Amino acid sequence: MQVWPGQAYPLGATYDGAGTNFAVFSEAAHRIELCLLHDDGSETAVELRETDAFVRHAYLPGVMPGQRYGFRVHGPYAPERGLRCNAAKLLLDPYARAVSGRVRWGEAVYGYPFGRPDARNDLDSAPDTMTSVVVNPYFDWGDDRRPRTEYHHTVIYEAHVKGLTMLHPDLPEELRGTYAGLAHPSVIGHLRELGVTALELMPVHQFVNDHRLVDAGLSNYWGYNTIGFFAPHNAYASWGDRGQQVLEFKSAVRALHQAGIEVILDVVYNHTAEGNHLGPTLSMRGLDNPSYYRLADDPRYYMDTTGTGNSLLMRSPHVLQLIMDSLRYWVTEMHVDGFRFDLAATLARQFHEVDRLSSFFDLVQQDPVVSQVKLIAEPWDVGEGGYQVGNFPPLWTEWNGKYRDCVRDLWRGEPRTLAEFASRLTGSSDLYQDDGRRPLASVNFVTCHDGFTLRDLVSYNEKRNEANGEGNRDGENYNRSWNCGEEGETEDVGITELRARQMRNFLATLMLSQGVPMLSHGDEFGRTQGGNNNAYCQDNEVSWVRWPKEAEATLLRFTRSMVRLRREHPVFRRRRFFHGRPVLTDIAWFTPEGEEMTSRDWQAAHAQALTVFLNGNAISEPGTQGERIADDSFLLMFNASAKELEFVVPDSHGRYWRMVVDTSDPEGMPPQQGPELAGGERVTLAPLSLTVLRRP
Amino acid sequence: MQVWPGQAYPLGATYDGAGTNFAVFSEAAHRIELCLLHDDGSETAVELRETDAFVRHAYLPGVMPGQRYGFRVHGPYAPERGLRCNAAKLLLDPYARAVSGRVRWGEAVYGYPFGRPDARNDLDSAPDTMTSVVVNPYFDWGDDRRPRTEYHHTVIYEAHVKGLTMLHPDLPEELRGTYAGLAHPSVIGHLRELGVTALELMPVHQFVNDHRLVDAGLSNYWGYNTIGFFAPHNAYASWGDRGQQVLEFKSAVRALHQAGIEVILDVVYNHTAEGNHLGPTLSMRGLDNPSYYRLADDPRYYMDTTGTGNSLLMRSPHVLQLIMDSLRYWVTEMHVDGFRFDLAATLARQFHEVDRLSSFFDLVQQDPVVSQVKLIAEPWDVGEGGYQVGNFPPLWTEWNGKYRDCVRDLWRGEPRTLAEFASRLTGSSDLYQDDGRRPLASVNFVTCHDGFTLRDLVSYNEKRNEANGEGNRDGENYNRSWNCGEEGETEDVGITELRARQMRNFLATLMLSQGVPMLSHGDEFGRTQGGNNNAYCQDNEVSWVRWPKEAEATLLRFTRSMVRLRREHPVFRRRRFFHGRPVELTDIAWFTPEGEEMTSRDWQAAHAQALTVFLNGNAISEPGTQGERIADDSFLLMFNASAKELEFVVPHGRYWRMVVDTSDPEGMPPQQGPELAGGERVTLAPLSLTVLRRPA
Numbered sequence A: 001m002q003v004w005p006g007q008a009y010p011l012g013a014t015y016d017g018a019g020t021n022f023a024v025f026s027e028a029a030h031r032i033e034l035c036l037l038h039d040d041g042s043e044t045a046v047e048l049r050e051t052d053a054f055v056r057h058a059y060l061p062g063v064m065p066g067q068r069y070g071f072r073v074h075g076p077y078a079p080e081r082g083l084r085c086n087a088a089k090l091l092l093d094p095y096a097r098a099v100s101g102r103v104r105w106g107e108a109v110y111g112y113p114f115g116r117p118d119a120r121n122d123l124d125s126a127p128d129t130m131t132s133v134v135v136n137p138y139f140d141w142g143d144d145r146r147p148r149t150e151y152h153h154t155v156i157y158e159a160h161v162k163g164l165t166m167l168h169p170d171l172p173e174e175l176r177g178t179y180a181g182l183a184h185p186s187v188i189g190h191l192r193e194l195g196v197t198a199l200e201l202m203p204v205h206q207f208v209n210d211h212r213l214v215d216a217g218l219s220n221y222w223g224y225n226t227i228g229f230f231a232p233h234n235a236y237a238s239w240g241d242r243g244q245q246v247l248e249f250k251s252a253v254r255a256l257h258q259a260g261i262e263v264i265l266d267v268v269y270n271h272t273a274e275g276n277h278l279g280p281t282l283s284m285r286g287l288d289n290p291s292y293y294r295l296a297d298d299p300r301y302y303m304d305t306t307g308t309g310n311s312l313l314m315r316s317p318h319v320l321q322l323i324m325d326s327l328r329y330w331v332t333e334m335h336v337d338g339f340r341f342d343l344a345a346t347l348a349r350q351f352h353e354v355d356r357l358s359s360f361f362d363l364v365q366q367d368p369v370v371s372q373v374k375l376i377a378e379p380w381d382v383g384e385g386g387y388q389v390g391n392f393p394p395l396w397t398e399w400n401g402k403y404r405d406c407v408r409d410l411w412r413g414e415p416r417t418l419a420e421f422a423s424r425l426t427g428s429s430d431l432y433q434d435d436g437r438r439p440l441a442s443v444n445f446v447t448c449h450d451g452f453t454l455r456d457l458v459s460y461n462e463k464r465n466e467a468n469g470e471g472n473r474d475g476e477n478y479n480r481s482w483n484c485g486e487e488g489e490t491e492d493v494g495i496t497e498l499r500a501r502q503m504r505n506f507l508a509t510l511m512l513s514q515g516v517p518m519l520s521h522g523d524e525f526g527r528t529q530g531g532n533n534n535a536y537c538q539d540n541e542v543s544w545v546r547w548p549k550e551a552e553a554t555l556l557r558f559t560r561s562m563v564r565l566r567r568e569h570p571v572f573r574r575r576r577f578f579h580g581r582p583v584l585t586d587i588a589w590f591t592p593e594g595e596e597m598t599s600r601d602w603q604a605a606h607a608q609a610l611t612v613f614l615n616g617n618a619i620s621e622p623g624t625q626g627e628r629i630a631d632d633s634f635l636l637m638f639n640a641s642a643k644e645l646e647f648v649v650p651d652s653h654g655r656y657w658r659m660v661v662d663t664s665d666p667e668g669m670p671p672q673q674g675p676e677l678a679g680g681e682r683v684t685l686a687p688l689s690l691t692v693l694r695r696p
Numbered sequence B: 001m002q003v004w005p006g007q008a009y010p011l012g013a014t015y016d017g018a019g020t021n022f023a024v025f026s027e028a029a030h031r032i033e034l035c036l037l038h039d040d041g042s043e044t045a046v047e048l049r050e051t052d053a054f055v056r057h058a059y060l061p062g063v064m065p066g067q068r069y070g071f072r073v074h075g076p077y078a079p080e081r082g083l084r085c086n087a088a089k090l091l092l093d094p095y096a097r098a099v100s101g102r103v104r105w106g107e108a109v110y111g112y113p114f115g116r117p118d119a120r121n122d123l124d125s126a127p128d129t130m131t132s133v134v135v136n137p138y139f140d141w142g143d144d145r146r147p148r149t150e151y152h153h154t155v156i157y158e159a160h161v162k163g164l165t166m167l168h169p170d171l172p173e174e175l176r177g178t179y180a181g182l183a184h185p186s187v188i189g190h191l192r193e194l195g196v197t198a199l200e201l202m203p204v205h206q207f208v209n210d211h212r213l214v215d216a217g218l219s220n221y222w223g224y225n226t227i228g229f230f231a232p233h234n235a236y237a238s239w240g241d242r243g244q245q246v247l248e249f250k251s252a253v254r255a256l257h258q259a260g261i262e263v264i265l266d267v268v269y270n271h272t273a274e275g276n277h278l279g280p281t282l283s284m285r286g287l288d289n290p291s292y293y294r295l296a297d298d299p300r301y302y303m304d305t306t307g308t309g310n311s312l313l314m315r316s317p318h319v320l321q322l323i324m325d326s327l328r329y330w331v332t333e334m335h336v337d338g339f340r341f342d343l344a345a346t347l348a349r350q351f352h353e354v355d356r357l358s359s360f361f362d363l364v365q366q367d368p369v370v371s372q373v374k375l376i377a378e379p380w381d382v383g384e385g386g387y388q389v390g391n392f393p394p395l396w397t398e399w400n401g402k403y404r405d406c407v408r409d410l411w412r413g414e415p416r417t418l419a420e421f422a423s424r425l426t427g428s429s430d431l432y433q434d435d436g437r438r439p440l441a442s443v444n445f446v447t448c449h450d451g452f453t454l455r456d457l458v459s460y461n462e463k464r465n466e467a468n469g470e471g472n473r474d475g476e477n478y479n480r481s482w483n484c485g486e487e488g489e490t491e492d493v494g495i496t497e498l499r500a501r502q503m504r505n506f507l508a509t510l511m512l513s514q515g516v517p518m519l520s521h522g523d524e525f526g527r528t529q530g531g532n533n534n535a536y537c538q539d540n541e542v543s544w545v546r547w548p549k550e551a552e553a554t555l556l557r558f559t560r561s562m563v564r565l566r567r568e569h570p571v572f573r574r575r576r577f578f579h580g581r582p583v584e585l586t587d588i589a590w591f592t593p594e595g596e597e598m599t600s601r602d603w604q605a606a607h608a609q610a611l612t613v614f615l616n617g618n619a620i621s622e623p624g625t626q627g628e629r630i631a632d633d634s635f636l637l638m639f640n641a642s643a644k645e646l647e648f649v650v651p652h653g654r655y656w657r658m659v660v661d662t663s664d665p666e667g668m669p670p671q672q673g674p675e676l677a678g679g680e681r682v683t684l685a686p687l688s689l690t691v692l693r694r695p696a
């Protein structure tokens, strides 16, 4: 038999050489039973009797990795009390390091009769449920140098595990769309060729194909609907789901870490794949409903702060413990370099309000494992006071959703005051400066997985989510986009070259900006999604990354060479805001004709032209060793006008500035040199074009 | 000036091989300078310029360990807002891994002019102040097996580092009263001889003798008045103060851990040694006052839920981080095994009420370093809603204040504490069963550092603290004690035996009571504080532990034999609660002195001071380390707190053996006894105990 009492910590199934020590949390269970599934669907149940601080535990020697296991909570069923415990269902371990199988959708996985939401389901769950697996924690990272690339050298590349590699004509068939293929040399090379220093992996926690999707012809692609917070996703693993998916991810990191490539993965802690009531009872519903999920004034129904069914209680210690244990386990055992938190406002909702003194923030700021890895937050959620951009604690880094909306409104041509675009270029002073932050707190991005891609952003006015199954009712409605004259694809040479160069504008404005640049995957080649902007369920050629074999490889070498500029020239990645008001003047703003803009020229309604001077000799920032940082002085000239404009170079005839970037050109100016301008001489600059000059 | 920007983590002086990095937090400091002290007192200031998330820092190559340093925080001095920043006072390092020197009490360590509280003082504090020192973290714990003694084997021995060894006629005079003398073989041999598994260490966090106390002829001895949250008290060091005292501690833990004795130390996190205003500016008054201390509804004045000057803000993320970074520093760097939190209800006061969902409770519960060590609490503060015995989370253990009073009462004679004393032997079923805890969650104790020692407990009716300088106003006013005929020293052998046998009565009940016991240092030799019940300032023979050279060595072998009787028989240290009756095995049954099971009427019969308890050694419904069953001889405990003799009956056919008797003056847990029939009547003296041991 061999049922030893074991230990209470750590939570989950841990392989201590000769056996495995199990420990799960439930304060609302009279009895808890542990099931040991075999390869034929037989359950060898064991009662974890030894409770300690509402966590029941036991050590069962002989149990080893590959053991399919799960729990069955004997507890009250009373939605009136908030409890939905059911022994009939096979509950997943929240602390499971690897989950096997898919959810086979049926009336059994749900925990309530399909006609009576307050009755109780007595159907066995195991033959249709996912199944948590014990994992051997061993891995020999030889020299896993965490390439601790600082914020002022970081190029974040948002990408998917599957879409990035799925259609790659260099990975053998098996590896396309897996973690293993993500480690391939032709992808790491591409990533190292493109200049990225951080890789953002769209949700990699094990997530569930939604029932509403499976019974609609679709699947869950993005993966922002998760149940296994410690489990690499089994469907992204070509090495098996019997606890061998973690072996890929670890090896996927080590291969990536060898090339000086960081891994910052996208975490979704705000909600769970169990949805609201009327959803499935899979992992945490049956264990402890009241202290895992945020229930409403009527405990039957669920408080939502994400619009997606449920939301976790951020003040119950066993929920905070699960997230800190989740983060760290991905830091120190998966060697993940950082996290992009999803809708991170919900994580700071202690009772109702968004608190920046909330216990979650208190925890993260102090723990020596998480507080040092790159902490990125999506600074909003769909509750009251949901817009919190510029209110997270000064440790954090935020998605500048105001950079997206301000830049997409500049190149679109709207009367977005230049003084609204000029602080987004300076790196969002108005949002972060008083908070005690630096420009690197702003993660700038012209496009991400949400909204249009880059090609869709310069080709479509309104969304095209008909094929999502919701009558075009999902995604952002107006995306500050402009089709460039005709919506959809078109053979018009004028519309084509305009779109191909509007894209150039977006990537050029992004790199010359201050803070952290971010690229959505595919925009290097011009990835299209056919007007679809919220492709959470488009798991097909719509969201795959097509790979190039001329125009798509004109924009490619353009973008790479634009990254070289930001890298090579530290003026574009400064550690602290310019001031330059009274004395060296580290920034200056002149009009096209060549005079310093005035308070009246600045925010006058219809003005769409700028010249920006960036003083490379006024970087009062020490390097790593107190080394004073130098760089050539640059002259960025923006023309958001519909017309051809005449820009004067405002220094003197004394000196010479060489043009190094010019959006207008069809061959690509960031990868191709050009003429050097006199210094008082007039330079005609095409409509919706950009230009940069360089001088030491 | 080789000054590199350095890192912002961790806070404090860390030695990176080539040099040392300093990082300090202040969110209301415009300019922070790093003063580096020399041996002729001259300073060498350098700006910690690099402000990152309100943590200013720098790294200085070549700066070796032993360097005396400190921060001077230029900022606002305005007590109407709560700011007492003073760039004249040499602020300590809240993360000082060793603090040298002592406070020379003068008008210069005080930050304000003595006659005017809210004015400004520009007196240099440098020489009159302690100094935070850089420490080299190396120490070779070759094979330092943390003796992770279980919870149901612990015997806590609360000791002070100085009194334990200042008067031991075996250490060299160098080592009397220091950390090294605490780990001499003659001491660890005694703790081994006594059977303890834990050494509760009265505060070693480096503290300051109060100005209040030093202009009186006295000196703070206990040390519950702390500034150094990372340093060992330099006045306990025989090896030096320039960072060398940290070695004393690390090597004093190495020795105790080799002989298998754990380290539990007394932490004081609720309050600081700067007290309220009118007091010094040493570490946190001048660093960032409003974010460190819990301020009033008038920022000039300090909230005080402790009565010791001030209280700490348990909601500012950077005070909880200072606690945690301290907590994890004594386990991960100095190999401590647990902490006793003092006034631990103040730690949970997040705003006003004692919140068991306070961030602090959610921080300890989660952290892998601190949730695993022994978490012992003193569950009360003097503030409103202070007494919270039985209300801490289930992860926590408490000093059972309702045990101490109710056993002090019983042997004192009060006609109430029988049904109450019963549960206190049961393990305080009232206070802990429903909370989800075990009998072990209650630290039982009759006497501690507070109140009377055990000899004073039976030799005084009221306090005698005139020597403390507050005219007998401090401490407990009634401590639930009895003088046994005469208060003070007598020679009547009738009283003296009653005292020496009363001392046997508590220790007997303490080692036979369910849960975790605690021994105050010196109650083996019958230590006497001369009636001083609150001796926090008596750093003299009053609290010095007197080592014995006839009666003193009789009670000694009494206690040691009782702590064994706990060890060798697990019933007195059970791991679950009793249930008494299989409604449809009987593991406990209470009998009358007459010899019949009691009745709910006869239980709460007011006039009753006699008892017979049965314990079933064969009905321990608990597993063992390897699923085994626990087996034991069954015991029969006979309490007579009556003023006279009462004939006690054994419940007929079998035999029983008498193992414990308080009455006979040779001491009879080390002295073998007769065999009692099983129906026979037995005479039990007034205020005495008896235990029977037929094997089951």
Ligand SMILES: Nc1nc2c(ncn2[C@@H]2O[C@@H]3COP(=O)(O)O[C@H]4[C@@H](O)[C@H](n5cnc6c(=O)[nH]c(N)nc65)O[C@@H]4COP(=O)(O)O[C@H]3[C@H]2O)c(=O)[nH]1
Residues within 6 Å of the ligand: A433, A436, A437, A438, A575, A576, A577, A578, A579, A620, B030, B031, B032, B047, B049, B050, B051, B052, B053, B054
């Ligand atoms: N010695 C010293 N000089 C100080 C200090 N604070 C400001 N200065 C000087 O005064 C300017 C104003 O700084 P700010 O208004 O806080 O506005 C600051 C702040 O927004 C940001 N910044 C610069 N360095 C840091 C830093 O290390 N950490 C953070 N968090 N922000 C920084 O850049 C702004 C100004 O950059 P600068 O070109 O440095 O211009 C700074 C610098 O000239 C200080 O505490 N000590």
Ligand SMILES: Nc1nc2c(ncn2[C@@H]2O[C@@H]3COP(=O)(O)O[C@H]4[C@@H](O)[C@H](n5cnc6c(=O)[nH]c(N)nc65)O[C@@H]4COP(=O)(O)O[C@H]3[C@H]2O)c(=O)[nH]1
Residues within 6 Å of the ligand: A030, A031, A032, A049, A050, A051, A052, A053, B433, B436, B437, B438, B576, B577, B578, B579, B621
């Ligand atoms: N920390 C901790 N404390 C424990 C544990 N088990 C018992 N205790 C405490 O000790 C009491 C004695 O339990 P019992 O003698 O087994 O008498 C128990 C036992 O026979 C049964 N029982 C209670 N819980 C369980 C359980 O989870 N499994 C099984 N099989 N029986 C249980 O019902 C009785 C009443 O249980 P309680 O009301 O809780 O009464 C329990 C509870 O107060 C434990 O695993 N951990």
